[PDB]
């Protein structure tokens, strides 16, 4: 309904974004308030390549200047196509609190969101905020991406201090990403 | 001439009357009581505060505040684009690009103060040979934004089209002192 209204429009289709005051890493980070993490299928069957904000923003800002991108769709995905169980284990090794799974089906883990969806404020979860995490599955096929727009995207291995250094306790408030065992990346 | 301030120590073989005089300063710490009665002397005074927006304190005709471009009694913008009011403005605040007015006269097309500059020093109202730029007695012109302090020429003539009843009285009160 945009192409049929304003053709020759740029449409960026980014992956699930992370950054300071995000809703992606600071989501799984705050599962620690409960007993543990209820993530589906022990995390597997959910392949994810997240992307950093500035990679998206530097992509937009350069898309509003090229003679290219007069209709070209895009996909701002980033490298290191992680797997969710290892994507979260990285977070809770970075955020040194603890990590034990607590697997579930969508029979209940989509209903818990309907309990927290009954919040007049900014909810902690929803019917659908549970399901984006689990729909999240894609392989890059043909689309242009960042690297043919101006940006050389950033891996999550590097800019994860800045967004999880808050979620730690004293006795882990300085821990040097030299430490913490980088995640296992899947190519498929 | 020099004056000693703390120099009195001389053991006069202090008599027992001068001991209690000292031994009751201590054990009743009375030198401090002379301070408590001193602050008790002030709550019973009239507090000098003034209800500000209803009682705005005293000023004088030379109080220099918000700039304004005065105007002759028959219209005719009193500025003549000399440029000896940015050649002296030490904060480097004024840009007064000019032209012939198309009457053949000589007036500004541009005038400016960056009031985030403008040290409020008075060099521009005392340098102006025509009494065009003055520095009015405003002091309530705070702004929520940075752009409202970049008075160019239309915010600054009509400002002078506002306070001219209040400026000229002070200028008339002071053209003998300057």
């Amino acid at each position: 309904e945009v192409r049929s209204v304003f053709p020759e429009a740029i449409i960026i289709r980014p992956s699930d974004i992370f950054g300071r005051e995000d809703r992606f890493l600071n989501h799984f980070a705050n599962y620690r308030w409960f007993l543990a993490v209820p993530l589906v299928s022990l995390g597997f069957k959910t392949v994810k390549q997240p992307v950093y904000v500035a990679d998206v923003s530097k992509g937009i800002v350069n898309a509003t200047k090229d003679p290219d991108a007069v209709g070209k769709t895009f996909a701002f995905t980033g490298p290191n196509r992680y797997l969710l169980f290892h994507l979260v284990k990285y977070i809770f090794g970075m955020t040194h609190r603890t990590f034990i799974p607590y697997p579930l089906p969508l029979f209940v883990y989509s209903w818990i969101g309907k309990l927290f969806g009954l919040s007049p404020f900014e909810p902690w979860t929803t019917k659908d905020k549970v399901e984006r995490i689990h729909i999240s599955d894609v392989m890059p096929t043909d689309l242009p991406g960042l690297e043919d727009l101006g940006v050389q995207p950033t891996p999550l291995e590097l800019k994860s201090i800045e967004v999880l250094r808050r979620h730690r306790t004293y006795r882990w408030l300085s821990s040097e990403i030299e430490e913490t065992k980088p995640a296992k990346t899947v190519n498929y | 001439t020099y004056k000693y301030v703390n120099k009195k120590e001389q053991e006069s073989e202090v008599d027992m009357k001068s001991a209690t005089d000292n031994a009751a300063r201590i054990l009743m710490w009375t030198e401090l009581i002379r301070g408590l009665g001193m602050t008790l002397s002030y709550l019973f005074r009239e507090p000098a505060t003034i209800n500000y927006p209803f009682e705005k304190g005293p000023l004088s005709p030379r109080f220099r505040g918000e700039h304004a471009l005065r105007r002759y009694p028959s219209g005719e913008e009193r500025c003549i684009a000399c440029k000896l009011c940015e050649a002296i403005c030490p904060a480097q605040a004024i840009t007064i690009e000019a032209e012939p007015r198309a009457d053949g006269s000589r007036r500004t097309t541009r005038y400016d103060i960056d009031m985030t500059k403008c040290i409020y020093c008075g060099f521009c109202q005392e340098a102006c040979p025509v009494d065009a730029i003055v520095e009015g007695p405003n002091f309530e012109f705070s702004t929520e934004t940075h752009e409202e302090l970049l008075y160019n020429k239309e915010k600054l003539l009509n400002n002078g089209d506002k306070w001219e009843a209040e400026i000229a009285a002070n200028i008339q009160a002071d053209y003998l002192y300057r």
Binding site: - | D114, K117, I119, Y120, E140, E144
Partner: protein, 155 residues
């Protein structure tokens, strides 16, 4: 009715924030002298519910008096990023608004607004103590006209 209740709550929520706002023991230049003369017995802050507390955690507004140098700048945003976030800002002076003198020097930031966002700007080289007082009465209505519960109902 719900909106009328929320407008009055949001008018009643602000009465506290605007009356009892606790500015912060800043300094740095001549301009700060006038804040003392605004703590003085002529134009009393305390009569307006305005109190110096010298810690940001206890604070509700920053008053930036004086040239905000490049060395002081980290210590100015390390401090603005230590309050809670109903935090407000006030820029006393022409050294803090634009850097009036020292706009072209090398060790001076050309405005408090380069670094911390600001609600109000008080001009004057030494703005009269009855000219911050006009500002922190104007900041005292700039958030009388904030609608933080209204735009929650319609959202």
């Amino acid at each position: 009715r719900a909106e009328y209740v929320v407008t009055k709550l949001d008018d009643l929520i602000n009465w506290a924030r605007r009356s009892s706002l606790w500015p912060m023991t800043f300094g740095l230049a001549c301009c700060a002298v006038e804040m003392m003369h605004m703590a003085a017995p002529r134009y009393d802050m305390d009569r307006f519910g305005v109190v110096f507390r010298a810690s940001p955690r206890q604070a509700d507004v920053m008053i930036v008096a004086g040239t905000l140098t490049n060395k002081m700048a980290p210590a100015l945003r390390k401090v603005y990023d230590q309050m809670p976030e109903p935090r407000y800002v006030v820029s006393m002076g022409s050294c803090a608004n634009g850097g009036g003198y020292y706009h072209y020097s090398y060790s001076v930031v050309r405005g408090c607004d380069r670094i911390v966002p600001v609600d109000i700007y008080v001009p004057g080289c030494p703005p009269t103590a009855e000219a911050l007082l006009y500002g922190i009465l104007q900041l005292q209505r700039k958030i009388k006209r904030e609608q933080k519960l209204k735009i929650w109902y319609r959202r």
